[PDB]
Amino acid sequence: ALIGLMTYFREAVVNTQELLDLLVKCENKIQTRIKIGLNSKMPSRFPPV
Amino acid sequence: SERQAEVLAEFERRKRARQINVSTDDSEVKACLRALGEPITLFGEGPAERRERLRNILSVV
Amino acid sequence: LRRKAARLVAAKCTLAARVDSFHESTEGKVGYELKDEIERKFDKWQEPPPVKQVKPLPAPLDGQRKKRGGRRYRKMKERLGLTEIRKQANRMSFGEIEEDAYQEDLGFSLGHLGKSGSGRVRQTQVNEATKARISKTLQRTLQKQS
Amino acid sequence: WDRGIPRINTLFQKDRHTLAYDKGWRVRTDFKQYQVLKQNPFWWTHQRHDGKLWNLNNYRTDMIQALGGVEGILEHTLFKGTYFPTWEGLFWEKASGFEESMKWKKLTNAQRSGLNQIPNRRFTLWWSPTINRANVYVGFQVQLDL
Amino acid sequence: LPTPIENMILRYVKAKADWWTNTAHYNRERIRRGATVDKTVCKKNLGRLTRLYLKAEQERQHNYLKDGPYITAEEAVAVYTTTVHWLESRRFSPIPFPPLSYKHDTKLLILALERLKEAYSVKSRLNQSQREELGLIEQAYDNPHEALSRIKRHLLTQRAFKEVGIEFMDLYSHLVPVYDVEPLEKITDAYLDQY
Amino acid sequence: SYMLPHLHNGWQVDQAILSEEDRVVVIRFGHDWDPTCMKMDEVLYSIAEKVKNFAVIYLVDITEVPDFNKMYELYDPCTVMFFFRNKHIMIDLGTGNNNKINWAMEDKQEMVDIIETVYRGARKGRGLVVSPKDYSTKYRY
Amino acid sequence: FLGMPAPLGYVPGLGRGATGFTTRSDIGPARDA
Amino acid sequence: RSLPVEEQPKQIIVTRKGMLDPLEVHLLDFPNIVIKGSELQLPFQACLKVEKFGDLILKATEPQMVLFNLYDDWLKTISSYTAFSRLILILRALHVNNDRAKVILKPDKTTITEPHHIWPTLTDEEWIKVEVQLKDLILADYGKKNNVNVASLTQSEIRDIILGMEISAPSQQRQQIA
Amino acid sequence: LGVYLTKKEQKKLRRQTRREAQKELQEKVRLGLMPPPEPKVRISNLMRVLGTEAVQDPTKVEAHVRAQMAKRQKAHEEANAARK
Amino acid sequence: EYLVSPITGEKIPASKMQEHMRIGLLDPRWLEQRDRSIREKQSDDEVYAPGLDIESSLKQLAERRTDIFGVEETAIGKKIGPEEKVTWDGHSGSMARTQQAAQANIT
Amino acid sequence: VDPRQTQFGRNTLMDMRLSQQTVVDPKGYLTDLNSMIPTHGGDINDIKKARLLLKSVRETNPHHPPAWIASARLEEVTGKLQVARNLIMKGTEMCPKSEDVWL
RNA sequence: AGUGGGUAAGAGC
RNA sequence: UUGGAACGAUACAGAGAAGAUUAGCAUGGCCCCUGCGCAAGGAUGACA
């Protein structure tokens, strides 16, 4: 989904700050879902590696 | 011993049962069963069960 | 239920003609004797469906159940077995990153299939035992539609 | 090489002769959403006809570089716990023998749903020295029985 | 069924239907706004919306059949005359029927089969419908001439077709229709589109 | 709700638990008039016949049968208990309370999966079974 | 068995070997010794 | 390449693992010809120990290529599967002893090896007796080098020994698995 | 007058007789009056039925399987001759 | 009339002829399948309560859900508009106390 | 690429052996003037392993024209069309007698 | 900021 | 001798994995083929 959006809408993301906020929010949503999948408790200092 | 003898006896009894002709008419089957001295219906059995009972009775006799 | 009904009526209509052309049952006794059975057939076709019990879900299985082997088992094992190209497909090379060749989906890769270090100098051939073929009834329908 | 919008790679594509007779493929790709149950992120371009319009080689190169490289990334993992002399001659296996053989054995919904989580278990085990750390999960630590 | 009992059931069904419609048109609008909803809720709402849309479509088709076409004769004549004038002005030659000796009779079939097969390029598992479709595709690919002959026969004679299924992809803003067609007709339609 | 069998005193509940030798007993503890209990009742009635082979469904009103409220913590609006051969079975649902299903589940497929997993685990002699689906998060999005 | 009254002087909590549980201390009445 | 397409092989099995790489290199034009490695050691290197082969190759002053028919005439009465099994048993025995095996090859002076082929011509029952004697030879010699009774071996074990299976364990402490 | 029967009834009668004979043989094996049937081995079937034992002494195995095949063939021929 | 059964070889009247055929080749495993069907039918257990229980349950629910029934609208679970039962706490220590309380509960 | 197109439109041998009351059946060697297998691209899975093996063949059998031809065609189908030219030039400097390398 | 969503089940002594 | 606790307490135990697992033959289905039997039935050869 991310490559489709970014390749289709390149040069149009930069002016759409709402899109940047939505993108980072959705990425955090995905990370939160994976972390909940690992353990049923939010990590405090989870690493990005 | 008696176990082999009895199981073989029942084996050929069943084989005889498979090779005995019984009429498909329900009335004739009822008359034959009455002649044999057995009740026509056994606790509300179906006609196929009645025919099977008549066949087994004929096989034994 | 229309077309079928028509056929039935036609048949009975024919009978009526085959009677009326010889001037029999001028009162219409054959007419009633055919119309009542036509109504009976219509009622049977339109009858409410009977009561059909639902099958409870079978209980989970445990222990062992003896299943035979033989030619059918061999054929089914060949059909459902892991093929060499399929076995090489789900092998992913450690460390060496591969560019995703499927734009429409990044979640699909061939693994070692076509990748360097796969241990195959030659190309892995296609196991024709996994060929896709139609059912028997589909073959029958295709032959009818030919 | 990867500059023109109808990427030059399409000139050298294997099926460059049979693709020339494929006309109106953008409209077909757009309308494909009415036939397939899955929405297509690349509803607008065709990889075969138009080529690959994006390269992730540099992005993944710099992502490996930023994370400290394979050495640091594997330091975060159980790789050194496998005592493998090097990271070069290694490969993964997406599914286990029983896991792959169980992809179709007439299982129930609960059974298959539970079975679908095995790759998650392998993933958690591969990242144990990092996920199972005191800093990330603050609170009381419990040792296993044995 | 007794008449009072039938009236009881009819009134109960009317009340349940009103509740069902209101619940569907409330949950759908809640989902459109971005509200946090469960997964089974979305599936149930999509089912309800599909049933509602199909009831509306049944009513629309019945109204079209009962009241006749909505396009008047004069408007149709104007449209057709405009199209005729455009085609004549462009020196356009009508598309011929695919001949039995067409030079590109094979490339189009190959492209249509490739397009049909791309539906399963990633599908690790196939049910009976998918494997039957793949078998038909492969059988047509092994004997291209027989496939083309069947395509021509269906174009020339086939007018009645089998029932096509309908499903709806939920985008939480609109319900996109997805149509399920039999593979036998699908190959013919794909070749026709390519040609 | 009203379709499923109802138990009126604690002795009947004991007899129902004891009399099942090869089926898991699923008992809904709550009040028939409770909306959450109503959801449990409708789901159970929907799947009361599908899982008849390896399960059975009983309904107990804790107001008329409070005899377990102290021991089984029967104070939530609706609870679900699973028993196998006179032995209460725990389910690691992921909510932190393995003893019972204290919340209403909308999907009947999820409850069928739960019952089947309970039957599989308890048949093998185990007392706690891991739920096929995690429930520490409602997955609402 | 359905439709049958309980025996006199029988504890339904007993007669089965059942054992309760305590998920927490906030729920349930205070235990009395 | 010399043979026609119909008679070209489809499986090439090599006893040694050293041919897995080179063959695939030189068979790069034949993709439908799968190459199989063999963990079991078929005693084919001992076929030169036959008196008809070592002398022939030692006095061959120039490289060339020759054809033989290892199944002399047995195919007239037994299927090629039985012929292959008998041949592999004979080669196993020849690799084992090469002296008592030669004695077992001829049970009587009547059995004469004609120059047309290699193995002596024997009656069917005589072939059965020679086969069982060679099996006894192989089992006894394996027992000699493993201190195991012939009767101690089982049918599957005897099959493995004829094929060439061995059992060894320098590090048995993996018994800690149990 | 003699009465014919439809092809459906012919198929059903033949199937019933064959199933009766098969059940008869199976229950004869059940009661010990009949030895359990031996696998039918041909040249192709050889290495599948007697694979673990054909390596012991291949020529004896070939003789045994050919003897079984010839026994079946000669039983068929003698049944034909007796029916002649 | 009189016809010879092609499967039995007996002189049978033609009036029953077709019927004589239908029940002539009837496969006994059909009888076996019917027997197992009737046995599994009698092996069922009543998953749902009878009519009296359903009617009583609906009466009980109506007496409580006055927002759906009745004339007077009280709260969700109130019927309107001495002896207190003692229950074991699940602790083996209090087993004897509960037993003697139940004994004292006797009439 | 075909020049008509616009923006919008291996390891061979040299020795063959003929197949036809004795035990020895010698086969005379047969040589062919040309041995040119087509490009047959895509049949090589491990490009690096095949390249290493062909380099080993070239080292061990420097006077084997099929080795040079196969190595060069593997480089060509890989896309490294300059190393293929270099390999062929080395082979020509190493196998001047066989004209297949020069072709 | 914060509680939890982190009970292995089993055998009798 | 005489009590708290027992939803506790150690000892033993711990794969809390995952399965109704897999080999052979025959029956079963369609298509032949071959032999015999049964029911019949065709075309054809042969003087004094």
mmCIF file of N, CA, C and O in Angstrom, chain F residues 55-89:
data_model
loop_
_atom_site.group_PDB
_atom_site.id
_atom_site.type_symbol
_atom_site.label_atom_id
_atom_site.label_comp_id
_atom_site.label_asym_id
_atom_site.label_seq_id
_atom_site.Cartn_x
_atom_site.Cartn_y
_atom_site.Cartn_z
ATOM 1 N N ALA F 55 -20.524 -31.503 22.632
ATOM 2 C CA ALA F 55 -20.822 -30.461 23.605
ATOM 3 C C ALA F 55 -22.293 -30.547 23.989
ATOM 4 O O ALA F 55 -23.075 -31.280 23.380
ATOM 5 N N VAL F 56 -22.658 -29.791 25.023
ATOM 6 C CA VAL F 56 -24.048 -29.641 25.431
ATOM 7 C C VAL F 56 -24.175 -28.285 26.104
ATOM 8 O O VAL F 56 -23.214 -27.770 26.678
ATOM 9 N N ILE F 57 -25.364 -27.696 26.015
ATOM 10 C CA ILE F 57 -25.600 -26.330 26.467
ATOM 11 C C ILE F 57 -26.660 -26.347 27.556
ATOM 12 O O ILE F 57 -27.738 -26.923 27.374
ATOM 13 N N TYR F 58 -26.352 -25.710 28.682
ATOM 14 C CA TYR F 58 -27.294 -25.537 29.775
ATOM 15 C C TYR F 58 -27.301 -24.074 30.193
ATOM 16 O O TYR F 58 -26.277 -23.389 30.130
ATOM 17 N N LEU F 59 -28.467 -23.601 30.620
ATOM 18 C CA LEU F 59 -28.638 -22.225 31.062
ATOM 19 C C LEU F 59 -29.014 -22.219 32.535
ATOM 20 O O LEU F 59 -29.924 -22.945 32.949
ATOM 21 N N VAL F 60 -28.312 -21.406 33.319
ATOM 22 C CA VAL F 60 -28.527 -21.310 34.756
ATOM 23 C C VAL F 60 -28.707 -19.846 35.122
ATOM 24 O O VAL F 60 -27.880 -19.002 34.756
ATOM 25 N N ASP F 61 -29.785 -19.548 35.842
ATOM 26 C CA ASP F 61 -30.049 -18.204 36.342
ATOM 27 C C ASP F 61 -29.442 -18.085 37.736
ATOM 28 O O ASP F 61 -29.898 -18.742 38.676
ATOM 29 N N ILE F 62 -28.414 -17.245 37.872
ATOM 30 C CA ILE F 62 -27.712 -17.133 39.145
ATOM 31 C C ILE F 62 -28.554 -16.493 40.237
ATOM 32 O O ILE F 62 -28.209 -16.614 41.415
ATOM 33 N N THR F 63 -29.641 -15.804 39.887
ATOM 34 C CA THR F 63 -30.548 -15.318 40.920
ATOM 35 C C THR F 63 -31.305 -16.470 41.566
ATOM 36 O O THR F 63 -31.393 -16.557 42.796
ATOM 37 N N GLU F 64 -31.859 -17.368 40.750
ATOM 38 C CA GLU F 64 -32.520 -18.549 41.286
ATOM 39 C C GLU F 64 -31.534 -19.638 41.684
ATOM 40 O O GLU F 64 -31.895 -20.527 42.462
ATOM 41 N N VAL F 65 -30.306 -19.590 41.174
ATOM 42 C CA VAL F 65 -29.257 -20.529 41.569
ATOM 43 C C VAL F 65 -28.009 -19.741 41.954
ATOM 44 O O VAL F 65 -27.042 -19.702 41.181
ATOM 45 N N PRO F 66 -27.982 -19.097 43.121
ATOM 46 C CA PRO F 66 -26.780 -18.378 43.555
ATOM 47 C C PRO F 66 -25.716 -19.262 44.185
ATOM 48 O O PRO F 66 -24.689 -18.742 44.631
ATOM 49 N N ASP F 67 -25.929 -20.577 44.188
ATOM 50 C CA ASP F 67 -25.115 -21.507 44.955
ATOM 51 C C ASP F 67 -23.660 -21.540 44.515
ATOM 52 O O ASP F 67 -22.821 -22.061 45.256
ATOM 53 N N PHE F 68 -23.342 -21.010 43.339
ATOM 54 C CA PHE F 68 -21.971 -20.968 42.860
ATOM 55 C C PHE F 68 -21.381 -19.567 42.860
ATOM 56 O O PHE F 68 -20.168 -19.428 42.661
ATOM 57 N N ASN F 69 -22.193 -18.533 43.110
ATOM 58 C CA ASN F 69 -21.729 -17.159 42.931
ATOM 59 C C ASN F 69 -20.489 -16.873 43.764
ATOM 60 O O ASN F 69 -19.560 -16.204 43.296
ATOM 61 N N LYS F 70 -20.453 -17.366 45.000
ATOM 62 C CA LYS F 70 -19.267 -17.181 45.827
ATOM 63 C C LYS F 70 -18.079 -17.947 45.263
ATOM 64 O O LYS F 70 -16.975 -17.402 45.141
ATOM 65 N N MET F 71 -18.286 -19.215 44.901
ATOM 66 C CA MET F 71 -17.150 -20.065 44.559
ATOM 67 C C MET F 71 -16.654 -19.802 43.144
ATOM 68 O O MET F 71 -15.445 -19.832 42.891
ATOM 69 N N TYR F 72 -17.560 -19.529 42.209
ATOM 70 C CA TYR F 72 -17.193 -19.340 40.814
ATOM 71 C C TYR F 72 -17.114 -17.874 40.413
ATOM 72 O O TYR F 72 -16.970 -17.578 39.223
ATOM 73 N N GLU F 73 -17.197 -16.957 41.376
ATOM 74 C CA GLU F 73 -17.138 -15.520 41.110
ATOM 75 C C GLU F 73 -18.187 -15.112 40.079
ATOM 76 O O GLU F 73 -17.922 -14.349 39.149
ATOM 77 N N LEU F 74 -19.400 -15.635 40.256
ATOM 78 C CA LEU F 74 -20.496 -15.394 39.318
ATOM 79 C C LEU F 74 -21.132 -14.036 39.616
ATOM 80 O O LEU F 74 -22.252 -13.923 40.118
ATOM 81 N N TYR F 75 -20.385 -12.986 39.289
ATOM 82 C CA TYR F 75 -20.848 -11.620 39.489
ATOM 83 C C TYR F 75 -20.783 -10.757 38.242
ATOM 84 O O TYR F 75 -21.366 -9.667 38.245
ATOM 85 N N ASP F 76 -20.108 -11.196 37.187
ATOM 86 C CA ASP F 76 -20.176 -10.491 35.922
ATOM 87 C C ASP F 76 -21.576 -10.635 35.327
ATOM 88 O O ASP F 76 -22.312 -11.562 35.674
ATOM 89 N N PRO F 77 -21.977 -9.713 34.446
ATOM 90 C CA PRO F 77 -23.319 -9.823 33.851
ATOM 91 C C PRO F 77 -23.560 -11.149 33.154
ATOM 92 O O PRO F 77 -24.674 -11.681 33.219
ATOM 93 N N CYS F 78 -22.546 -11.706 32.495
ATOM 94 C CA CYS F 78 -22.678 -13.001 31.840
ATOM 95 C C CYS F 78 -21.334 -13.708 31.833
ATOM 96 O O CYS F 78 -20.326 -13.123 31.431
ATOM 97 N N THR F 79 -21.324 -14.965 32.270
ATOM 98 C CA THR F 79 -20.114 -15.771 32.289
ATOM 99 C C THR F 79 -20.381 -17.101 31.602
ATOM 100 O O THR F 79 -21.516 -17.580 31.569
ATOM 101 N N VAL F 80 -19.328 -17.693 31.050
ATOM 102 C CA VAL F 80 -19.413 -18.982 30.375
ATOM 103 C C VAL F 80 -18.426 -19.930 31.036
ATOM 104 O O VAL F 80 -17.249 -19.593 31.200
ATOM 105 N N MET F 81 -18.904 -21.112 31.414
ATOM 106 C CA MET F 81 -18.089 -22.119 32.074
ATOM 107 C C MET F 81 -18.063 -23.389 31.236
ATOM 108 O O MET F 81 -19.089 -23.800 30.684
ATOM 109 N N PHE F 82 -16.886 -24.003 31.147
ATOM 110 C CA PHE F 82 -16.689 -25.245 30.411
ATOM 111 C C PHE F 82 -16.235 -26.331 31.373
ATOM 112 O O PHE F 82 -15.289 -26.128 32.142
ATOM 113 N N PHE F 83 -16.902 -27.482 31.327
ATOM 114 C CA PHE F 83 -16.575 -28.611 32.187
ATOM 115 C C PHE F 83 -16.393 -29.866 31.349
ATOM 116 O O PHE F 83 -17.062 -30.041 30.331
ATOM 117 N N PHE F 84 -15.493 -30.744 31.787
ATOM 118 C CA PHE F 84 -15.282 -32.027 31.125
ATOM 119 C C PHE F 84 -15.005 -33.084 32.180
ATOM 120 O O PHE F 84 -14.002 -33.000 32.894
ATOM 121 N N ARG F 85 -15.889 -34.079 32.264
ATOM 122 C CA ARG F 85 -15.806 -35.150 33.256
ATOM 123 C C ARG F 85 -15.676 -34.581 34.670
ATOM 124 O O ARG F 85 -14.735 -34.882 35.408
ATOM 125 N N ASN F 86 -16.647 -33.741 35.030
ATOM 126 C CA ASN F 86 -16.724 -33.151 36.369
ATOM 127 C C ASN F 86 -15.434 -32.419 36.731
ATOM 128 O O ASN F 86 -14.914 -32.542 37.840
ATOM 129 N N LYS F 87 -14.903 -31.657 35.780
ATOM 130 C CA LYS F 87 -13.685 -30.890 36.020
ATOM 131 C C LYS F 87 -13.761 -29.597 35.226
ATOM 132 O O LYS F 87 -13.802 -29.628 33.993
ATOM 133 N N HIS F 88 -13.785 -28.471 35.933
ATOM 134 C CA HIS F 88 -13.815 -27.173 35.276
ATOM 135 C C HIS F 88 -12.539 -26.963 34.471
ATOM 136 O O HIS F 88 -11.434 -27.214 34.959
ATOM 137 N N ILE F 89 -12.697 -26.503 33.233
ATOM 138 C CA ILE F 89 -11.592 -26.330 32.298
ATOM 139 C C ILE F 89 -11.341 -24.844 32.104
ATOM 140 O O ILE F 89 -12.280 -24.068 31.891
#
